[model samples]
Target chain A: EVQLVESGGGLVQPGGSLRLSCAASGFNIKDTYIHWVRQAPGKGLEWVARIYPTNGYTRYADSVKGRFTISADTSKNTAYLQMNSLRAEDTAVYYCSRWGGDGFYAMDYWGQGTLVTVSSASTKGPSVFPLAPSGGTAKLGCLVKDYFAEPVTVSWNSGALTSGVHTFPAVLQSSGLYSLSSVVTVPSSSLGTQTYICNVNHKPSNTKVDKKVEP
Target chain B: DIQMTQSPSSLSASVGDRVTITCRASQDVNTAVAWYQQKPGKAPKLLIYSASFLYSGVPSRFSGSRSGTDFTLTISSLQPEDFATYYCQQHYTTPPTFGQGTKVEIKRTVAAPSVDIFPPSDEQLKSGTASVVCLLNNFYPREAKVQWKVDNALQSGNSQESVTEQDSKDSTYSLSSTLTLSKADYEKHKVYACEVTHQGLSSPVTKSFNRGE
Candidate 1:
């Protein structure tokens, strides 16, 4: 199995420089192509850049062609994406994926993603995850993080099944952003029939981003 | 990713004949290439890795040897079961990429598949979306190339693609290709078609669905 651990991402002031890394394990860094992608706060994913370590060839998206450069360090088995002079609207969750492996066709492995927020005005949403059932109940966790306001709310849109729903208090991080998890539970039978939706509401901006999951 | 330059456009060999499949990397990979073998109706089997080292369970007859940027998977003497497919892979990189399989096939063994297009349900068309399923049944050797077309032009986007090869039984595999189109296109376009290709078939197995068919 291959693992890509991404690091060095957080809240950065506008115009600040940042370098994020995707460290490789269980495989060589120079054997495949590393693709960098980013998704805006509530928008679809955008291709940022790619780096081919074997040949030192690189390509970039037009939006950040000059500022964002992707590179690799074979000695460290790591791929890096460096960006400079960032802006507030550049807030996104950056992901690194590899286009290689047994299939040799498309990207089959991906990093857990690193969120880089350029300013405090953006609203980060929750990621809905359904955990393995213990006996008969499926535990669904909606991980919400990196938002400026503390008054954010997390709710599940499962018609009136409120017994197994609970939200944790938002914890302030050193980066001046808040993070929390709202967990909801349901019968394992519902896992196949129902698509649970996690609604994250940013109180100040009134921006609601909903995430869906099924176990 | 660096692509490997493959040699020998074809691999047609007989029993007891020694066969060698060679692959050359763009640059020196240093024991990074691994070789694989796949027989009829069987999954890929690892023959060698680390450029020259063989897997413990694989036969001693198959060996991999390499120098600098050139690599080779040689069968000492092809046995009855050895006449199948071979692939080379480079695993030293982040994720390994496999070669475009070199098949050492025995002559005169092929089974062409039967294909047809199945239109969507009457209820499905009522939702303003029409789907057509192309079924490739009883295909030998397990895999085939599939393509979709609209009125003679090749279709790419605005379609769902997962062309799963479902196992029908122990002997042959069944493949199904499905695509969705808006109701507008189903009415306006004359031909929504599919084609499946395999080594056994002399020509592509093509099927089409016409308006409201």
Candidate 2:
């Protein structure tokens, strides 16, 4: 019966500040711990911060350490995340989850996500490279750089690409944008002097970048 | 941070098969492990939590248990819908981490499609236009793509693609694409190639029809 709701997400110019709140119902927030997780559109989930309202104990991801703040108020039964000097790379859908006990990070319940956007950032398209063949298998890497906003979808188009892998939990770049790379592994027997393509789609911009792989 | 590792990264099983996926945590996570099932293009679904506890509404066929640092998610009777990637996450550490993932795929013997080019039987070549049909036959999973090339250059001409219903007899897929090219290109004796790619294809199915041939 417990529930968490997240709000206060919108557009912010570079260098601006952002503050989000998570309200809880059907459970006592004072005794339970709340945590923040964010995901850029095409990226995997990344832990942002956690707060124990009872004693104000907190922990944050190393990457967001100084730029992000986590706090909770027992009186309000709510938890908050405040970030200063926001950049395009900071744009993401932030979520709140109730932490299950057992020294575990089990997020038994999750809040509806809030979409935060940071505007006006340059984005580079996608590039593909072939990795060394290993034990009758071939691997390809597709790299996307400096994409504005959160959430980028990268897809592969090739007869050879039967399976794919990507860098989970994308990292932010100092350029105020995000960079991610996806890799696909195929059987070496599938490799020929044929063409393969990597498609990168940026949701906010509705932009697409398609690059063909070199033989 | 607790690390989770899954073995047999990928597996092939048939319906009604008994499948078990295991996850090992670097440190003692006790019963703090959760299992998730992720199909392509969909958000992962939580299946089990606290190691042995099944999430509400999840089928009884999906069960979990843990001993020490190792946890197991077992499927007593695998279903066609149960073929997917499974991930294990450990919450016992400051930074929760997920196992790489184990893919459960239906065991199916797949055959690559056979591709061939069908040019207009009429003397359209003299009229400076050619309608080319690239027929791909007998692939599995009903997924395939067609790429066209004329004289080593990619061409996206007026084309039509189709995916016929899988045949009930052998459960194979048949796909085809038709491309129309100008007569000048065909008169130049250029090579027209149709490359067919499918999920079941380890290599592309290619057929080239040189003008002279």
Candidate 3:
């Protein structure tokens, strides 16, 4: 029976470093690849990094490329994730999962998550933009900026019924905060009113910012 | 990374029923897909590898196959323990991707087994000999094991089981087994136990026997 356990998460100070570990048993860890995934509280899942223990071939998601480093020690049958220069928004649950055998690389085995939190202040309100629609309907973009914590939720309200609202995952900006965008469509027939509201909520502060569309 | 999509996100099935789930890949993965079973709070278990090869110790009723970009995982006869989430993954590329999981649930009309024990006939009991017959009826699927115990210790010898029989009308299964012990061993006042294991059971079904009863 193969098993995996994740450890090493609690609290960290800003500008400090954190290292998480994943211990595996019942199989040869060196023979397969292990990956790091994270889920910010109230946010969607993200692939952070992956390392092939057998050959040391590694890959990183574009967003976390330079900030997170993934390594493994075959002798100990364990994988490690080291993140440097942590910020308040870096707090999230980290998980280590094994890649499938053969040509498939999906994660089939996952370790229980470890929660990491950084002590810091809450984020300010986000900036919203109403962009031009190329085809079917009017478009609205909500951009949350400089949030010390993540999984910021965005909601949309409009005069007309919108088909569906599409929200993108949060990204870390160069300034050490995070940015996220959500887009919603307005039916062409409702273009005359041209009125919509974008509501952005930051969890850390229990605060909200509303952006109303201008004629 | 190859994207995988699964259909029928969830379904309800009864014991002895046949269920099939499918996974489609964004591109042809050349049979590099695998099937997994994950119970709540437990890690995923590999059921099929390389699309068609069954994993070691996996039951024969579980099978996998693929055609072009479409792959399938089929349960020949659904067992009670088979209720869980199923996922399909493609290993044809690095950073393998999984299909959204499919959940299998128990059908509302499924029935539990009815069990009974028959002790030795009066003549045999009078002679201090013991032979106990255990009968299990109305269980869906023919998956179960009959166990015997003497004096609370598991016993293996002098035991025989009949082939499970299925009812044509309801598709339920009936099975019978017997355990025999020598006259001297029967007179020890030892407790005899009949235990049945089925996936549908939360725990093993047990019936005990004592002298004079």
Off by over 4 Å in 1: A1-215, B1-4, B9-19, B24-50, B55-62, B67-70, B75-117, B141-213
DockQ of each: 0.02, 0.05, 0.02
In order, the Cα lDDT scores of the candidates are 0.66, 0.70, 0.69
Give the per-residue lDDT of model 2 (tens digit) for B74-121. Answer: 999987677667888887777777777887766545767766566532
Docking class of 3: incorrect
Docking class of 2: incorrect
Name the better of 1 and 3 by TM-score: 3
User: What TM-score does the predicted chain A of each candidate obtain versus native chain A?
Assistant: 0.61, 0.55, 0.54
Over A61-133, each residue of candidate 3 has an lDDT whose tens digit, in order, gives 7666788889999999999999888876677788788876534444657897777777654445444343223
DockQ of 1: 0.02
Q: What TM-score would every model get versus the actual structure?
A: 0.35, 0.53, 0.46
Error of 3 at B117 (Å): 38
Between candidates 2 and 3, name the one with more favorable DockQ: 2
Best by TM-score: 2
How does residue A212 of candidate 1 score in lDDT?
68
Compared with the true structure, what per-residue lDDT tens digits does model 3 show for residues B6-54?
9889887777889999999999899788888866434567788889988
